[PDB]
Design an enzyme around this catalytic site. Structure first.
Site, PDB file in Angstrom:
ATOM      1  N   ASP A 114       0.885  -1.194   0.000  1.00 57.86           N
ATOM      2  CA  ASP A 114       0.000   0.000   0.000  1.00 57.86           C
ATOM      3  C   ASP A 114       0.918   1.239   0.000  1.00 57.86           C
ATOM      4  O   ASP A 114       1.851   1.332   0.840  1.00 57.86           O
ATOM      5  CB  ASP A 114      -0.859   0.008   1.257  1.00 57.86           C
ATOM      6  CG  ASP A 114      -1.658   1.305   1.432  1.00 57.86           C
ATOM      7  OD1 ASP A 114      -1.994   1.987   0.433  1.00 57.86           O
ATOM      8  OD2 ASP A 114      -1.976   1.607   2.593  1.00 57.86           O
ATOM      9  N   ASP A 155      -4.270   3.818   2.771  1.00 54.29           N
ATOM     10  CA  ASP A 155      -5.672   3.372   2.959  1.00 54.29           C
ATOM     11  C   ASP A 155      -5.756   1.888   3.435  1.00 54.29           C
ATOM     12  O   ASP A 155      -6.821   1.397   3.724  1.00 54.29           O
ATOM     13  CB  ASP A 155      -6.520   3.642   1.709  1.00 54.29           C
ATOM     14  CG  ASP A 155      -6.148   2.716   0.532  1.00 54.29           C
ATOM     15  OD1 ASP A 155      -5.043   2.092   0.509  1.00 54.29           O
ATOM     16  OD2 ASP A 155      -6.949   2.623  -0.389  1.00 54.29           O
ATOM     17  N   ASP A 165      -1.748  -1.398  -3.841  1.00 54.62           N
ATOM     18  CA  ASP A 165      -2.130  -0.704  -5.073  1.00 54.62           C
ATOM     19  C   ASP A 165      -1.028  -0.947  -6.147  1.00 54.62           C
ATOM     20  O   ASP A 165       0.031  -1.524  -5.845  1.00 54.62           O
ATOM     21  CB  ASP A 165      -2.354   0.779  -4.713  1.00 54.62           C
ATOM     22  CG  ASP A 165      -1.241   1.309  -3.818  1.00 54.62           C
ATOM     23  OD1 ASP A 165      -0.119   1.361  -4.290  1.00 54.62           O
ATOM     24  OD2 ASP A 165      -1.456   1.642  -2.637  1.00 54.62           O
ATOM     25  N   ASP A 177      -9.603 -17.225 -15.625  1.00 58.42           N
ATOM     26  CA  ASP A 177     -10.330 -17.553 -14.435  1.00 58.42           C
ATOM     27  C   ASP A 177     -11.477 -18.544 -14.719  1.00 58.42           C
ATOM     28  O   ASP A 177     -12.207 -18.381 -15.710  1.00 58.42           O
ATOM     29  CB  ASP A 177     -10.865 -16.232 -13.861  1.00 58.42           C
ATOM     30  CG  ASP A 177     -11.605 -16.438 -12.577  1.00 58.42           C
ATOM     31  OD1 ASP A 177     -10.928 -16.738 -11.577  1.00 58.42           O
ATOM     32  OD2 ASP A 177     -12.877 -16.289 -12.594  1.00 58.42           O
ATOM     33  N   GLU A 206      -7.382 -21.686 -15.453  1.00 59.43           N
ATOM     34  CA  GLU A 206      -7.776 -22.156 -14.128  1.00 59.43           C
ATOM     35  C   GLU A 206      -8.910 -23.173 -14.383  1.00 59.43           C
ATOM     36  O   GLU A 206     -10.028 -22.761 -14.638  1.00 59.43           O
ATOM     37  CB  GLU A 206      -8.316 -21.034 -13.256  1.00 59.43           C
ATOM     38  CG  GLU A 206      -8.564 -21.550 -11.817  1.00 59.43           C
ATOM     39  CD  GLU A 206      -9.368 -20.588 -10.987  1.00 59.43           C
ATOM     40  OE1 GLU A 206     -10.234 -19.857 -11.546  1.00 59.43           O
ATOM     41  OE2 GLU A 206      -9.060 -20.477  -9.778  1.00 59.43           O
TER      42      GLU A 206
HETATM   43 CA   LIG Z   1      -3.465   1.891  -1.340  1.00 56.92          CA
END
Ligand SMILES: [Ca+2]
Length: 558
Positions: free
Chosen positions: A21, A25, A29, A199, A253
């Site tokens: 991060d 927050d 990210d 996926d 997958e």
């Molecule tokens: Ca963040």
């Protein structure tokens, strides 16, 4: 042959929510991936697969996609994404992204239109069916809890969702759906992405007329949902119209596919996908009915599956090999012994195993440090929509006592591998200046990348060493695999062979000294690497004295 970049690559999987991060927050990210690319390059990683990075309400942490062409708000902007690509390119690293096209979020434009009424142009982008006796259209259960059919009051019909209510399944029988999805893939591929990970690729084709599942089928329903008649028509058509027009590696997958059906997705002659993500080994110890429950397993069980998965790919398919990921408990806890006396030796043993398979190895973030399961105590300590689904189905119905349920999901929960990555020994393991979204393991003081990167004895440095070894010895990528004894429950020993070049991997899964005499006329030519060795190995040795959790790779005499 044929060698390809993706068969010899070592991939690293980044779960962006939990990697780094960079704005306090508590959520990882894209900028946090960017700032740690040098760390991954030092590890020796040449390709990164990221979990979904798109606009998403996060019912399933990115796998419920609300807009396929927008960056998830929590991860950053399109400019951050384009910078990830450029900074990877500067470092000769390739990006694989997660393609989630079995379903969208129920907030996606197509669904909002679809549900507005039978006359909407998007009605048939999803599966809408009438109730049966004021009950669901049939007895299909959802992977994430309850019925696979959700009643809509606007229309009085039910829509199909194999996963959460908020993940309505896309109608691949509608050619207009497939065309839209292809244009969406071209949007990403046109940005120079090198890989696609599909996926739940095996569930795109639904069963004509939706018949009820038998009683027996309800105990193993994932396999019924992969029996759609057109799954290979659809995957091959996607190959012909999109995938074969770009220069990419594709993984599938294949959840719910029996191993003997898996090859059709990956046989190169079928022009479908490149790389198999199978569930056979990683969930060998999981109940097929009560999919949150685990059971005892043995090494002979484990190795027999490794062999069978290797044989199935055979000449024309190809495997990914991994022992954990964002959907499974951490390898050292699940397959190793994560207690302080053994954790590092077992992590290095498992690294050795991973980096000597005839497969593209995938290293999941934090495994290179020997990160462990997290000590969850109460249901509220979990985040995962899936575990809450199992809780509602099994505990709130009074079928399973809460404490027995917890004893199992502590071992099996996907959230075990979602605790934030342990960067260093500072507050919150250096993951965030804020409050992490999911609590960090308190073992971060013992287990963190800062404590390892410059210690030549570290788990991190042993992974680094193994990756360079694998790059140097072609037989560790392409060599054929032979298990020396599939019924041995203590010492895991196998060969990798290319012509006269023959290497032996030996791992002692016991916490006691194990003597192990090689079979036939095999004897040692060189030690390539060992961890936790005490007894020296000399030229022509026919026996190894294995310390507990000892692992090693050896060149054999020809
Ligand atoms: Ca963040």
């Amino acid at each position: 042959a044929l060698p390809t970049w993706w068969k010899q690559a070592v991939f690293y999987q980044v779960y962006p929510r939990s990697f780094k991060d960079t704005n306090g927050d508590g959520i990882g990210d894209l900028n946090g991936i960017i700032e740690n690319l040098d760390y991954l390059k030092k590890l020796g990683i040449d390709a990164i697969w990221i979990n979904p990075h798109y606009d998403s309400p996060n019912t399933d942490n990115g796998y419920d996609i609300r807009d396929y062409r927008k960056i998830m708000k929590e991860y950053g902007t399109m400019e951050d994404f384009d910078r990830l690509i450029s900074e990877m390119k500067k470092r000769n690293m390739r990006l694989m992204i997660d393609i989630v096209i079995n379903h969208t979020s129920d907030q996606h434009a197509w669904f909002v239109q679809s549900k507005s009424g039978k006359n909407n142009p998007y009605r048939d982008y999803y599966f809408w069916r009438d109730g049966k006796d004021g009950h669901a259209p049939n007895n299909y259960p959802s992977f994430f809890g309850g019925s696979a059919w959700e009643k809509d009051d606007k229309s009085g019909q039910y829509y199909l969702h194999y996963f959460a209510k908020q993940q309505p399944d896309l109608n691949w029988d509608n050619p207009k759906v497939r065309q839209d999805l292809y244009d969406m893939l071209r949007f990403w591929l046109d940005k120079g992405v090198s890989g696609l990970r599909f996926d739940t690729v095996a569930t795109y084709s639904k069963i004509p007329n939706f018949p009820d599942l038998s009683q027996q089928q309800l105990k193993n329903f994932a396999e019924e949902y992969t029996k759609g008649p057109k799954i290979h028509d659809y995957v091959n058509e996607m190959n012909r119209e999109v995938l074969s027009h770009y220069d990419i590696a594709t993984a599938g997958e294949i959840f719910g596919v029996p191993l003997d059906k898996s090859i059709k997705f990956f046989d190169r002659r079928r022009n479908e996908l490149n790389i198999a993500f199978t569930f056979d080994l990683i969930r060998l110890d999981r109940d097929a009915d009560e999919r949150w429950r685990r059971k005892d397993w043995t090494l002979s069980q484990f190795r027999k599956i490794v062999d069978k998965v290797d044989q199935t790919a055979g000449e024309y398919g190809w495997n990914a090999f991994f022992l954990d990921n964002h959907d499974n408990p951490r390898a050292v806890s699940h397959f190793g012994d994560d207690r302080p006396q053994w954790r590092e030796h077992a992590a290095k043993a498992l690294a050795t195993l991973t980096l000597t398979q005839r497969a593209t190895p995938f290293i999941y973030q934090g495994s290179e440090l020997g990160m462990t399961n997290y000590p969850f105590k109460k249901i509220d300590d979990f985040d995962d929509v899936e575990v809450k689904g199992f809780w509602q189905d099994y505990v709130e119905t009074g079928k399973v006592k809460a404490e027995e349920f917890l004893q199992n999901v502590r071992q099996t929960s996907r959230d075990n591998s979602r605790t934030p990555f342990q960067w260093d020994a500072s507050k919150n393991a250096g993951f965030t200046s804020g409050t992490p979204w999911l609590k960090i393991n308190p073992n971060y003081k013992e287990i963190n990348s800062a404590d390892q990167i410059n210690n030549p004895n570290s788990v991190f440095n042993y992974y680094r060493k193994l990756i360079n070894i694998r790059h140097d010895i072609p037989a560790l990528t392409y060599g054929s695999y032979i298990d020396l004894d599939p019924d041995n429950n203590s010492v895991y020993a196998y060969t990798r062979t290319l012509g006269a070049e023959k290497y032996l991997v030996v791992i002692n899964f016991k916490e006691e000294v194990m003597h192990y005499t090689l079979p036939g006329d095999l004897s040692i030519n060189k030690v390539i690497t060992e961890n936790n060795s005490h007894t020296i190995v000399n030229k022509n040795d026919r026996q190894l004295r294995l310390e507990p959790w000892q692992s090693g790779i050896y060149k054999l005499n020809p």
